[PDB]
Structure 1
Amino acid sequence: AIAMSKGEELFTGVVPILVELDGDVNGHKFSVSGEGEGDATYGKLTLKFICTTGKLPVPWPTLVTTLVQCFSRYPDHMKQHDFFKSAMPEGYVQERTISFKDDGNYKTRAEVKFEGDTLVNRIELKGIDFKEDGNILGHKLEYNYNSHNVYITADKQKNGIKANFKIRHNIEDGSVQLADHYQQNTPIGDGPVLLPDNHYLSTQSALSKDPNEKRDHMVLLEFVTAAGITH
């Protein structure tokens, strides 16, 4: 009857989300602002992102992973493995290196936490060693998004988790641009967190445009469900 974590209880209903990103890729500076809502009961996110600095100097798809895994649906039998909600409201630090095959890399640091009743994701992104006419700076990536598995393991030493996964970005010629993700999350607060057994998040994302929106932007619908442990 008691929740597996105090934080879990913060997610039983619809939660408004704000996303703020400042980025610099190969010296191209940009900012992204996002608003929407999440409903963890259904592993559901709906968000609209706008590039507030003009044209985005990288493809929108390359920023999806960076731009709230606390909205994942953990099945009841797996709720003792939900690190993300357990760190709330104080939140967690989420860091990644995203290595684009035969191209540059993003390094990201984010803090995900509640501000009032709003779930906020604040991110700094740094991109280096991109090729001027590779798939990223050359904008050769299709505006779509594949379905992936995010493999999570406990990091007991750090009182947190790691994740490893491979993102596949479709290239306009029919090929694929791999983006290898290595990920670390650690709690911001001093409260206890849930350290999970090995499992994965199964993700699915749909990208669209707002037909009235003139700014460079991305509308996103995403479903994420934890899996990999039986009852």
Structure 2
Amino acid sequence: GEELFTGVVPILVELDGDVNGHKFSVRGEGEGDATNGKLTLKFICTTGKLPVPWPTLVTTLVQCFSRYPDHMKRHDFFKSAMPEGYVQERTISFKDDGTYKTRAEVKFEGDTLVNRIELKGIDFKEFGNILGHKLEYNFNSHFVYITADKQKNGIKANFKIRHNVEDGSVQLADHYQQNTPIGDGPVLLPDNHYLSTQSVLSKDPNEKRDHMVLLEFVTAAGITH
């Protein structure tokens, strides 16, 4: 299960979204390096301009690439559900604004880890921070708290994402998350821990499509050796 992740692994991310009727698609490729907890990905909006700001899609656009330290390896649900993978479901509530609901299947197809997502955003204020494009092009650092969901043979997670707003203020996105194994084989259910996540966003200066270049670093912690 973890063996699938010892080297560099090609990644494919595919998102279809509908926000307040804006229909759009994102495709991203790149590679993950679970050993160092590192992703590098380029994302393209294939339907034209992205109708929401890129930072809001970041948590939706593969936590199996988290680097778990040796002494925590028994708490890695993500890798253990591999290669048949897992389903990852989120409700994301933007403070004083709309909601994303997301459903993704994360699994291997051949040598490639694939994150396939449908996204539905409703109730967004036009001229709010999201449909208004008022979020800075960057991303902050967070703790993702994970807990075992024994009855669904999976895990749950809560966290608040803080999005920098161009006027200096911060927009909250309350994330609720459930992951559930695809396939009836055995998986690892973790003691309570967290993932520490850090992300850098940039642009390709030769890319003319609307896009995001993403670097991510994640390590699991919160369980004392």
State if a TM-score over 0.5 links the two structures: yes
Supply the distance in 1 between the matched residues of 2:159 and 2:194 (Cα, whole angstroms): 9
SS of 2:196 mapped into structure 1: strand
Identity of aligned residues (%): 96
SS of 2:151 mapped into structure 1: coil
Residue 22 of structure 1 deviates from its aligned partner by 0.2
Residue 181 of structure 1 deviates from its aligned partner by 0.3
Structure 1, unmatched stretches of 5+, are 1-6
1:24-65 Cα offsets, whole Å, 9 max, x none, are 000000000000000000000000000000000000000000
Supply the distance in 2 between the matched residues of 1:230 and 1:11 (Cα, whole angstroms): 24
Supply the distance in 1 between the matched residues of 2:56 and 2:80 (Cα, whole angstroms): 28
1:44-97 Cα offsets, whole Å, 9 max, x none, are 000000000000000000000000000000000000000000000000000000
SS of 1:58 mapped into structure 2: coil
Which of 60, 71, 85 is the matching residue for 1:91? 85
Normalising by structure 2, report the TM-score. Answer: 1.00
Query: 1:160 maps to what in 2?
Result: 154
Give every structure 1 segment of 4 or more consecutive aligned residues whose post-TM-superposition deviation is greater than 4 Å: none
1:115-145 Cα offsets, whole Å, 9 max, x none, are 0010000000000000011000000000000
SS of 1:157 mapped into structure 2: helix
Normalising by structure 1, report the TM-score. Answer: 0.97
Supply the distance in 2 between the matched residues of 1:132 and 1:30 (Cα, whole angstroms): 17
1:161-197 Cα offsets, whole Å, 9 max, x none, are 0000000000000000000000000000111000000
Supply the distance in 1 between the matched residues of 2:170 and 2:198 (Cα, whole angstroms): 17
Supply the distance in 2 between the matched residues of 1:192 and 1:18 (Cα, whole angstroms): 25
Supply the distance in 2 between the matched residues of 1:222 and 1:186 (Cα, whole angstroms): 23
Q: Cα RMSD over matched residues?
A: 0.3
Supply the distance in 1 between the matched residues of 2:68 and 2:183 (Cα, whole angstroms): 22
| Aligned positions of 1:65-144 closer than 5 A | 65-144=59-138
Structure 2, unmatched stretches of 5+, are none
SS of 1:41 mapped into structure 2: coil
SS of 2:139 mapped into structure 1: coil
